[PDB]
Amino acid sequence: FADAQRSHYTVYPSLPDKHIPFVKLLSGKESEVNVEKRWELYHQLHSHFHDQVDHIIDNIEADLKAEISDLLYSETTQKRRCFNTIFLLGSDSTTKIELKDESSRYNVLIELTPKESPNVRMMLRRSMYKLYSAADAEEHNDVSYDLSLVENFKRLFGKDLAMVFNFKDVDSINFNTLDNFIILLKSAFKYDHVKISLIFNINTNLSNIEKNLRQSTIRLLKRNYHKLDVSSNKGFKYGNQIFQSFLDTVDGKLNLSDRFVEFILSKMANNTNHNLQLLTKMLDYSLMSYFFQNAFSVFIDPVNVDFLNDDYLKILSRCPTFMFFVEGLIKQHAPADEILSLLTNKNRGLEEFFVEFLVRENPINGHAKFVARFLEEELNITNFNLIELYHNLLIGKLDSYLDRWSACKEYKDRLHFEPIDTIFQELFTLDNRSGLLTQSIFPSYKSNIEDNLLSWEQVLPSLDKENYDTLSGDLDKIMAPVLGQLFKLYREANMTINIYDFYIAFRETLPKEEILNFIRKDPSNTKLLELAETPDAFDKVALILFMQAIFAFENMGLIKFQSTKSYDLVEKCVWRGI
Amino acid sequence: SLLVKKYCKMTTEEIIRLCNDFELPREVAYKIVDEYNINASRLVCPWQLVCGLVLNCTFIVFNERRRKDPRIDHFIVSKMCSLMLTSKVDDVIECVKLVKELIIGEKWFRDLQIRYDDFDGIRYDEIIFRKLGSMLQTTNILVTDDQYNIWKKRIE
Amino acid sequence: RINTIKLWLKKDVKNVWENLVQLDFFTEKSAVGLRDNATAAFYASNYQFQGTMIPFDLRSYQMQIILQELRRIIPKSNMYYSWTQL
Amino acid sequence: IKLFLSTDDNLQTYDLSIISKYLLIASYICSYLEPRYDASIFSNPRYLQPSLFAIERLLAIFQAIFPIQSLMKANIEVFQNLSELHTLKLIATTMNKNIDYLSPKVRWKVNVPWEIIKEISESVHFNISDYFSDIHE
Amino acid sequence: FLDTFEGYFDQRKRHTMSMAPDVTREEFSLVSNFFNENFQKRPRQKLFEIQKKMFPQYWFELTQGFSLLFYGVGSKRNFLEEFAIDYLSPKIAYSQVNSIPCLILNGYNPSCNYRDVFKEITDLLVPAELTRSETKYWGNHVILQIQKMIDFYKNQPLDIKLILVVHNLDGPSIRKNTFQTMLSFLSVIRQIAIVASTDHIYAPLLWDNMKAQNYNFVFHDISNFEPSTVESTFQDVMKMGKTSSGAEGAKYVLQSLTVNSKKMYKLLIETQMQNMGNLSGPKRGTQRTGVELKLFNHLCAADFIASNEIALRSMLREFIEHKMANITKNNSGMEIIWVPYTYAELEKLLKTVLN
């Protein structure tokens, strides 16, 4: 009957310009046109950045395909009784190998995932089914799905055979059945019309495969093998392209802060398989948050510069860089009229000041690429982060970053750049100081949950104005939420705790008088009243609350129960700050 | 070398004097001495515990006057290197953080934070939104309004 | 005790280990050789044994020829005949 | 002579992150060393199969051995790295087809030899040998 | 010293509930209800009103291809349902007349299967049928079809057509690697918005780099200390979990049912345990020990429960939909009704609610 007791029940909501997710800023004084302009500007920047990112992804796929095909067709000469083996080191099973369409033979690509390889018989059957299907499709009766198909391919289709196996996740594949399948495929070398090539997509070094394969198979593969280091972040070559795309998107309009770039470097250093996607997510969320939170983003284009209002003025006057500039002005000289006009005293004047000093272009967003280009023009250095280069340029330690190569000492002065502090810089700046980026993308799951449990006052409001009308107004002040108080006693307790002793401590740390007053404060429920009249009502109520809280902790994985024969002792599974 | 003293013997007079010189109300000082009495079992370094606890109490009681003036808290810790005569400040941080860890979940500290609206130095109306992950947080990229107001008053 | 016997490395002894396993001088610790029925063999083929998961170095084996048998067979003039009596 | 001196029958072992490397180090230390960490350390027995342990012990050892910044909490990134380590079969469980990482009855174990973990430890400049030298070299 | 690995090392170094007070089902229910809807109703309502102001940010994050994950202490079921149905769907509908359908996944249900969920997804948004060449050799017709969806939706306007809501993504049956892979592959599609919630504290352990990349989460912390009465319905609280059985949810359904449906279920259970006893305790119910629908119709007609087979099927639809009884066709072509609970669970159901 109830929809809550059902699984996967679909709901069709009954629906009842305000369709922009952006909300008004400046305490609601921001105009709707400003909100629409923020929406439009964010969409423009997002479209530019992700168009460039999609071009980069197409480039990586195309280059990987070209290199794999070149390795596959290398015209290597050897006694034709060996596999043409290609080890894609550090490669995820995502590439789509394309085979040349030779008219004198059938080039077949057979993909084999670990889920497709339970044993040797199924690997052979799924390889021969794919081979027969592909041959029939290209050719435009019935056979048995085994190596006799490879033997009789020349008779059936009249063309040679060029099977190319692609082992998608070699690490996940059981190496016993993979070794047996390789040995089985070795039996197909006695036919003059068949060429067998293998491509192992390896996520690690090949030493694991050497340890997990028989020495006979290792010697068989050693006859012909090519090693390819397939990685998106290999050589720091395409992460630099994505970062440069982001810089070109926000060139002049926005300035990345040094702390933001440090956060980017830290969060990309801890990820290996997927760094480009992580970098794109981080940059996209940073731009998203900046355009959602900042009402000064309407001034990215100069056209709206004239539309500055009093609230924009009030937000602007709190600019630390503006304060530094005005203190410098008052220190170098004391023009009373000029400093009054620049300050609030003639608010009008200040606006003109902004009208003149926001369109300044920060050279770093360009300069960072120029030095970058230098490293591929004369220095021929490719193993370097553009992100780290940009970070050290923002700090001002560019020479410290450059001296590691030691080959750029001759042009050390030419590449030197001294950063400058533009006024009103932090009005248009992507930064990480509020902890929003850390909390939203890489939060402390366990730590946040444990802090909510232990210190619940930061979560539940401590309201006191409406205390009288509510039923449990008195009980709210003294008694904490059962989960938080039980977690306090949980933390205070030892690793292995009896349930009854824990319940006794929990009952002790609750009061008895006002809770008994509250339990009978509802005259409508007679059962509550008659339970309260029972002499041991408080013990039963405390037991119910403790049982509910223990059930909750067991649901959230806080505790585990040991000695299921007696089921009286539980071991803690979560300690704070770990 | 007051911190390194182990199992030193003192009385309530020193504790109440320490509470008084930091301008602590009577009720909070009595809560302090009651907490000291109940935690006397964990008095490996009584001066360490009491100094950290009074540091946290002073932070809670005067969080908002601390909010106007960024100097005062540092000025406050000047007392900690003058009144009890130990110029070390790193040990002061050690004491305050360990005693914060010790009394993180106790009822009296929670009630004090609730009635003074501190919540680790950050008011509830904004700590809830920082915890929820709102993009509209009070980012520290600009200075606070009160700092701008006092700076304007100084410059005029 | 000594024209000196060479000490082969782990990479040069892995092949010898595999060869000795192939001749069934060693077996897995708890291994069923061949199932009696076709259905039992099919079920065993479907199951993925824990022995193949663990690395080659730590695989637990068990012999078919005990040390006393080696002492009996091996001639007294061998270099390792003193090492077949533990 | 060099041809006939070495068989040469072989055709930075991992590109893991520092979090993943320290997770592997902590897992190896936890599995191959008895739960006597309470006495002295953190303020060959490696010839046999690795033992079994729990997630909380691994996290505690990881926090103990991780270099300070003042301590490293368990973020989403740490758990993601641990799940990836299990994915690459470097760390296994008592899994049987269906596997639920969140079950309290699931216990973890290591699937790297001593050489791999030694190389990983020397990569991040960690002395796992000094930790393991107490029982035997 | 606590709150640190050193605290764990320090702490990692004979009373029973026999003498604890005895509490009845009714007493527990009434005390829990009164302490759930009256204890801190006002502070929790104020907190919900506070966190209801972040809905535009949630919708904005969902628009840019980010799946939302909600964690905390308490029941987020009400939060997720209200956000999705009452706010997200009408707003997306107006920004793109009918509202966007929402597929509310109840992950706290131990009987949640990805086959039925994918069937519902296929019904809601019709995909291209998987062709002969794309079925592969005994390939997974769910995963291959989802990849076909991904390829189809890659080049198509980035509107929103479905809003699937995953309650308690770490639940007993929704945490398994198969359904997690299903959700991971569905998360790549930008034409469906995903609003999931997790309660377990070790939840991030589920997802490796690939699954955490496909989800593309933006983690949001919503702690509200809510009772979580609905989530606790499917397993006994007095036993303190001493999870994936699903018999407790069946019993909870059995208090609120028609008397004819209760009698029909009782007859089905009795005959199934008769079959199990004929065959042989801890063994589950399968079609091997189950009733034929013709034989069940004959029994029900003999007991006047159902007049004809159409009425019997209509009654059985509710039990099949709730994953309480299953009708499956065996080798002989017979269609067999079987209840996927063990002998002890069926006996408990008969003694407690079906007595």
Short mmCIF file of C-alpha atoms in Angstrom, two decimals, chain E residues 1-341:
data_model
loop_
_atom_site.label_atom_id
_atom_site.label_comp_id
_atom_site.label_asym_id
_atom_site.label_seq_id
_atom_site.Cartn_x
_atom_site.Cartn_y
_atom_site.Cartn_z
CA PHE E 1 43.84 11.34 25.05
CA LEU E 2 41.34 10.57 22.28
CA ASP E 3 40.31 11.74 18.80
CA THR E 4 43.54 10.49 17.19
CA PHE E 5 45.21 7.27 16.07
CA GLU E 6 46.96 7.32 19.45
CA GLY E 7 43.51 7.30 21.03
CA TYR E 8 42.62 4.23 18.96
CA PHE E 9 45.81 2.51 20.13
CA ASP E 10 45.14 3.49 23.76
CA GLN E 11 41.56 2.21 23.72
CA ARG E 12 42.28 -1.02 21.78
CA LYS E 13 43.64 -2.88 24.80
CA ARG E 14 29.14 -9.19 32.81
CA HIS E 15 25.72 -7.54 32.71
CA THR E 16 23.13 -8.49 30.09
CA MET E 17 19.79 -7.20 28.81
CA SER E 18 18.17 -10.04 30.75
CA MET E 19 17.69 -7.65 33.68
CA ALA E 20 16.97 -4.65 31.45
CA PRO E 21 13.36 -3.39 31.50
CA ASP E 22 10.92 -5.24 29.26
CA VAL E 23 9.26 -3.16 26.53
CA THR E 24 6.37 -4.26 24.31
CA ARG E 25 5.91 -3.47 20.61
CA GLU E 26 3.19 -0.90 21.37
CA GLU E 27 5.20 0.81 24.12
CA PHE E 28 8.29 1.09 21.91
CA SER E 29 6.22 2.39 18.99
CA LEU E 30 4.41 5.05 21.02
CA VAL E 31 7.49 6.24 22.93
CA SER E 32 9.55 6.42 19.73
CA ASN E 33 6.81 8.30 17.87
CA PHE E 34 6.35 10.81 20.69
CA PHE E 35 10.11 11.37 20.95
CA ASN E 36 10.41 11.64 17.16
CA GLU E 37 7.63 14.09 16.27
CA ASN E 38 7.76 16.11 19.51
CA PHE E 39 11.31 16.10 20.95
CA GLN E 40 13.03 18.81 18.88
CA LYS E 41 10.46 19.49 16.18
CA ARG E 42 10.96 23.27 16.23
CA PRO E 43 14.80 23.32 15.99
CA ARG E 44 14.77 20.69 13.25
CA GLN E 45 12.09 22.59 11.33
CA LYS E 46 14.12 25.80 11.63
CA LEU E 47 17.24 23.97 10.43
CA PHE E 48 15.32 22.57 7.45
CA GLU E 49 14.06 26.05 6.60
CA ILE E 50 17.66 27.28 6.83
CA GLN E 51 18.98 24.59 4.49
CA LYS E 52 16.00 24.98 2.13
CA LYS E 53 17.61 28.21 0.88
CA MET E 54 20.39 26.28 -0.89
CA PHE E 55 18.02 24.63 -3.37
CA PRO E 56 18.96 27.05 -6.21
CA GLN E 57 22.61 26.08 -5.73
CA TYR E 58 21.69 22.38 -5.82
CA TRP E 59 19.72 22.88 -9.04
CA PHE E 60 22.57 24.91 -10.56
CA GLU E 61 25.10 22.20 -9.72
CA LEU E 62 22.80 19.55 -11.18
CA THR E 63 22.41 21.58 -14.38
CA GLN E 64 26.18 21.51 -15.02
CA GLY E 65 26.31 17.70 -14.98
CA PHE E 66 27.09 17.16 -11.28
CA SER E 67 25.40 14.37 -9.36
CA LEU E 68 24.44 15.50 -5.86
CA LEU E 69 25.39 13.42 -2.82
CA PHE E 70 23.88 14.21 0.57
CA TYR E 71 25.39 12.88 3.79
CA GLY E 72 24.88 13.55 7.47
CA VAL E 73 23.20 12.25 10.60
CA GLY E 74 19.44 11.74 10.40
CA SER E 75 16.85 10.96 7.75
CA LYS E 76 17.50 12.75 4.46
CA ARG E 77 14.55 10.97 2.82
CA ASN E 78 12.19 13.90 3.41
CA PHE E 79 14.84 16.40 2.29
CA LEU E 80 15.58 14.53 -0.95
CA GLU E 81 11.93 13.88 -1.79
CA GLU E 82 10.86 17.47 -1.13
CA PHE E 83 13.83 18.92 -3.04
CA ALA E 84 13.30 16.66 -6.06
CA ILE E 85 9.52 16.51 -6.39
CA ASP E 86 8.44 19.84 -4.90
CA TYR E 87 11.31 22.02 -6.18
CA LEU E 88 13.58 20.41 -8.78
CA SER E 89 11.07 18.88 -11.20
CA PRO E 90 8.72 21.90 -11.60
CA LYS E 91 11.69 24.28 -11.93
CA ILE E 92 13.37 22.15 -14.60
CA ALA E 93 10.02 21.79 -16.38
CA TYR E 94 9.50 25.56 -16.46
CA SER E 95 13.12 26.21 -17.48
CA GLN E 96 12.77 23.73 -20.36
CA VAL E 97 3.69 21.08 -20.35
CA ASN E 98 4.62 18.27 -17.96
CA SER E 99 7.07 17.92 -15.09
CA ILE E 100 10.22 15.82 -15.26
CA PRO E 101 9.47 12.28 -14.01
CA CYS E 102 11.27 11.31 -10.80
CA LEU E 103 12.38 7.73 -10.14
CA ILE E 104 12.53 7.50 -6.34
CA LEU E 105 14.98 4.70 -5.49
CA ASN E 106 14.39 3.33 -1.99
CA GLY E 107 17.85 1.97 -1.23
CA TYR E 108 17.04 1.16 2.39
CA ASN E 109 14.82 -1.59 0.99
CA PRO E 110 16.82 -4.86 1.06
CA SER E 111 14.80 -6.10 -1.94
CA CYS E 112 16.01 -3.49 -4.44
CA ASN E 113 17.14 -5.14 -7.69
CA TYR E 114 18.84 -3.42 -10.61
CA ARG E 115 16.88 -5.46 -13.17
CA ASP E 116 13.58 -3.90 -12.08
CA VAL E 117 15.16 -0.46 -11.74
CA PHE E 118 16.53 -0.61 -15.28
CA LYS E 119 13.16 -1.86 -16.53
CA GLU E 120 11.55 1.19 -14.93
CA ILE E 121 14.19 3.46 -16.48
CA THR E 122 13.57 1.90 -19.90
CA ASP E 123 9.82 2.41 -19.47
CA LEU E 124 10.29 6.05 -18.43
CA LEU E 125 12.73 6.93 -21.23
CA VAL E 126 12.49 4.60 -24.22
CA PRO E 127 15.92 3.67 -25.63
CA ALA E 128 16.91 2.10 -28.92
CA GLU E 129 16.53 -1.67 -28.65
CA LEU E 130 19.81 -3.55 -28.33
CA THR E 131 20.63 -5.02 -31.73
CA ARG E 132 21.87 -8.52 -32.52
CA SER E 133 25.46 -7.36 -33.03
CA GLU E 134 25.44 -5.33 -29.79
CA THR E 135 24.22 -8.13 -27.50
CA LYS E 136 27.64 -9.82 -27.79
CA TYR E 137 28.16 -13.38 -26.50
CA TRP E 138 25.98 -13.70 -23.39
CA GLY E 139 26.67 -10.06 -22.61
CA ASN E 140 24.96 -8.08 -19.88
CA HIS E 141 21.88 -6.64 -21.60
CA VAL E 142 21.68 -3.93 -18.92
CA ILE E 143 25.26 -2.62 -19.10
CA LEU E 144 25.40 -2.78 -22.90
CA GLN E 145 22.05 -0.99 -23.16
CA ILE E 146 23.24 1.71 -20.75
CA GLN E 147 26.38 2.22 -22.84
CA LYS E 148 24.10 2.51 -25.87
CA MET E 149 22.15 5.17 -23.95
CA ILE E 150 25.41 7.00 -23.24
CA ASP E 151 26.41 6.97 -26.90
CA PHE E 152 22.93 8.09 -27.98
CA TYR E 153 22.75 10.93 -25.43
CA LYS E 154 26.32 12.13 -26.02
CA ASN E 155 25.22 14.02 -29.16
CA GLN E 156 21.83 15.51 -28.21
CA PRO E 157 20.70 18.71 -26.43
CA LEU E 158 21.59 18.68 -22.73
CA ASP E 159 18.08 18.90 -21.31
CA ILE E 160 16.86 16.86 -18.33
CA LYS E 161 14.43 14.00 -18.98
CA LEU E 162 14.58 12.03 -15.71
CA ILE E 163 15.44 12.83 -12.09
CA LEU E 164 16.34 9.59 -10.33
CA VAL E 165 16.48 9.97 -6.54
CA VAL E 166 18.63 7.41 -4.71
CA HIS E 167 17.61 7.18 -1.06
CA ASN E 168 20.30 5.59 1.13
CA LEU E 169 22.71 4.66 -1.65
CA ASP E 170 24.72 2.51 0.80
CA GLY E 171 21.78 0.29 1.75
CA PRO E 172 22.06 -3.49 2.11
CA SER E 173 21.19 -4.35 -1.51
CA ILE E 174 21.95 -1.03 -3.25
CA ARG E 175 25.61 -0.99 -2.15
CA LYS E 176 26.62 -4.02 -4.23
CA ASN E 177 29.10 -3.60 -7.07
CA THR E 178 26.61 -4.52 -9.80
CA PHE E 179 24.03 -1.85 -9.02
CA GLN E 180 26.82 0.64 -8.25
CA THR E 181 28.21 -0.04 -11.73
CA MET E 182 24.71 0.47 -13.14
CA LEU E 183 24.44 3.85 -11.40
CA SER E 184 28.00 4.76 -12.44
CA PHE E 185 27.19 4.17 -16.09
CA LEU E 186 23.86 6.00 -15.76
CA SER E 187 25.66 8.97 -14.18
CA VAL E 188 27.59 9.65 -17.40
CA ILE E 189 24.33 10.64 -19.11
CA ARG E 190 23.81 14.39 -18.70
CA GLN E 191 20.10 14.12 -19.56
CA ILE E 192 19.25 12.57 -16.16
CA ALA E 193 19.84 14.32 -12.83
CA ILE E 194 20.96 12.21 -9.87
CA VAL E 195 20.18 13.20 -6.27
CA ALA E 196 21.55 10.50 -3.95
CA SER E 197 21.94 10.24 -0.19
CA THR E 198 24.24 8.12 1.97
CA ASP E 199 24.08 7.20 5.66
CA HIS E 200 27.03 4.83 6.19
CA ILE E 201 30.20 6.46 7.48
CA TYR E 202 32.47 4.37 5.22
CA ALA E 203 30.40 5.07 2.08
CA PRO E 204 33.27 6.62 0.02
CA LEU E 205 35.03 3.25 0.19
CA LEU E 206 32.50 1.98 -2.36
CA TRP E 207 33.70 4.04 -5.32
CA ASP E 208 37.11 3.84 -7.00
CA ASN E 209 38.48 6.47 -9.39
CA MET E 210 36.32 5.30 -12.31
CA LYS E 211 33.05 5.25 -10.37
CA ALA E 212 33.82 8.51 -8.56
CA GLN E 213 34.58 10.07 -11.96
CA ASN E 214 31.37 8.80 -13.57
CA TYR E 215 29.25 9.95 -10.60
CA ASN E 216 30.94 13.38 -10.70
CA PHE E 217 29.69 14.12 -7.20
CA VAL E 218 29.37 17.43 -5.42
CA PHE E 219 29.17 16.44 -1.75
CA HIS E 220 26.69 18.36 0.41
CA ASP E 221 26.45 17.96 4.19
CA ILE E 222 22.87 18.06 5.50
CA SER E 223 22.81 16.88 9.12
CA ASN E 224 19.41 17.19 10.78
CA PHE E 225 19.18 14.38 13.40
CA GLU E 226 15.88 13.20 11.95
CA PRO E 227 14.27 10.03 13.36
CA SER E 228 14.62 7.89 10.20
CA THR E 229 11.43 5.97 10.91
CA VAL E 230 10.94 4.83 7.31
CA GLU E 231 14.47 3.45 6.95
CA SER E 232 14.15 1.44 10.18
CA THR E 233 10.88 -0.16 9.03
CA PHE E 234 12.61 -2.92 7.05
CA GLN E 235 14.55 -4.45 9.95
CA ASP E 236 13.80 -5.11 13.60
CA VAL E 237 14.94 -2.52 16.12
CA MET E 238 14.48 -4.61 19.29
CA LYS E 239 16.86 -7.25 17.95
CA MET E 240 19.38 -4.41 17.36
CA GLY E 241 20.18 -5.89 13.96
CA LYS E 242 21.18 -9.25 15.44
CA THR E 243 19.56 -6.74 7.44
CA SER E 244 19.27 -8.08 3.88
CA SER E 245 16.50 -10.58 4.70
CA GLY E 246 13.59 -8.24 4.00
CA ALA E 247 11.10 -10.28 6.03
CA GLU E 248 10.54 -7.43 8.49
CA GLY E 249 9.31 -5.14 5.72
CA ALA E 250 7.02 -7.96 4.59
CA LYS E 251 5.56 -8.24 8.10
CA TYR E 252 5.11 -4.46 8.30
CA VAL E 253 3.15 -4.71 5.05
CA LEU E 254 1.16 -7.60 6.54
CA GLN E 255 -0.34 -5.56 9.38
CA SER E 256 -1.90 -3.21 6.79
CA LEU E 257 -3.55 -5.45 4.19
CA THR E 258 -6.99 -6.70 3.22
CA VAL E 259 -8.17 -9.81 5.05
CA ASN E 260 -8.52 -11.71 1.76
CA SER E 261 -4.95 -10.83 0.77
CA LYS E 262 -3.74 -11.88 4.22
CA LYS E 263 -5.54 -15.23 3.92
CA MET E 264 -4.14 -15.80 0.43
CA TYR E 265 -0.61 -15.02 1.62
CA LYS E 266 -1.08 -17.31 4.63
CA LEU E 267 -2.19 -20.18 2.40
CA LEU E 268 0.77 -19.59 0.07
CA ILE E 269 3.21 -19.58 3.00
CA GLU E 270 1.69 -22.73 4.50
CA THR E 271 1.88 -24.66 1.23
CA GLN E 272 5.42 -23.44 0.53
CA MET E 273 6.66 -24.59 3.94
CA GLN E 274 4.89 -27.90 3.30
CA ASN E 275 6.92 -28.21 0.09
CA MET E 276 10.14 -27.24 1.89
CA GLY E 277 9.55 -29.78 4.64
CA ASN E 278 8.86 -32.42 2.00
CA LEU E 279 12.14 -31.54 0.28
CA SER E 280 14.12 -31.49 3.54
CA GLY E 281 15.90 -24.25 8.27
CA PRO E 282 18.35 -21.67 6.89
CA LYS E 283 17.54 -22.32 3.20
CA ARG E 284 15.79 -19.57 1.25
CA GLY E 285 12.60 -20.07 -0.72
CA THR E 286 13.08 -20.66 -4.45
CA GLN E 287 10.88 -21.96 -7.27
CA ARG E 288 12.02 -25.49 -6.38
CA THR E 289 9.81 -25.18 -3.29
CA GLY E 290 6.85 -23.22 -4.64
CA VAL E 291 3.24 -23.50 -5.72
CA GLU E 292 1.99 -23.68 -9.28
CA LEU E 293 -0.42 -20.88 -10.14
CA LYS E 294 -3.05 -23.38 -11.33
CA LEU E 295 -2.74 -25.40 -8.12
CA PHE E 296 -2.78 -22.18 -6.09
CA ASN E 297 -5.93 -21.09 -7.93
CA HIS E 298 -7.55 -24.42 -7.10
CA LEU E 299 -6.63 -24.06 -3.42
CA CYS E 300 -7.89 -20.47 -3.24
CA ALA E 301 -11.16 -21.41 -4.95
CA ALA E 302 -11.55 -24.27 -2.47
CA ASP E 303 -11.05 -21.71 0.32
CA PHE E 304 -13.15 -19.02 -1.45
CA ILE E 305 -10.23 -16.56 -1.41
CA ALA E 306 -10.33 -15.95 -5.18
CA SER E 307 -13.21 -16.64 -7.56
CA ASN E 308 -11.09 -16.92 -10.72
CA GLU E 309 -7.48 -16.74 -11.88
CA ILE E 310 -7.83 -13.10 -12.99
CA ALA E 311 -8.73 -12.00 -9.46
CA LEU E 312 -5.91 -14.13 -8.03
CA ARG E 313 -3.40 -12.49 -10.38
CA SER E 314 -4.76 -9.06 -9.44
CA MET E 315 -4.19 -9.85 -5.76
CA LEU E 316 -0.73 -11.28 -6.49
CA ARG E 317 0.33 -8.13 -8.36
CA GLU E 318 0.68 -6.21 -5.09
CA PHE E 319 2.86 -8.90 -3.51
CA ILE E 320 5.01 -9.25 -6.64
CA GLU E 321 5.52 -5.48 -6.94
CA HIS E 322 6.59 -5.26 -3.28
CA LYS E 323 9.09 -8.09 -3.95
CA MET E 324 7.18 -10.34 -1.54
CA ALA E 325 6.27 -13.22 -3.87
CA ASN E 326 7.77 -14.12 -7.24
CA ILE E 327 6.11 -15.87 -10.19
CA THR E 328 8.73 -17.56 -12.38
CA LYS E 329 8.46 -20.11 -15.18
CA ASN E 330 10.40 -23.35 -14.76
CA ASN E 331 11.68 -25.81 -17.37
CA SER E 332 8.36 -27.66 -17.68
CA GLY E 333 6.60 -24.40 -18.58
CA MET E 334 4.75 -24.18 -15.27
CA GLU E 335 4.60 -20.80 -13.55
CA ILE E 336 5.53 -21.09 -9.88
CA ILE E 337 4.83 -18.70 -7.00
CA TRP E 338 7.57 -18.66 -4.37
CA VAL E 339 8.28 -16.42 -1.38
CA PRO E 340 12.05 -15.67 -1.09
CA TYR E 341 12.17 -16.05 2.71
#
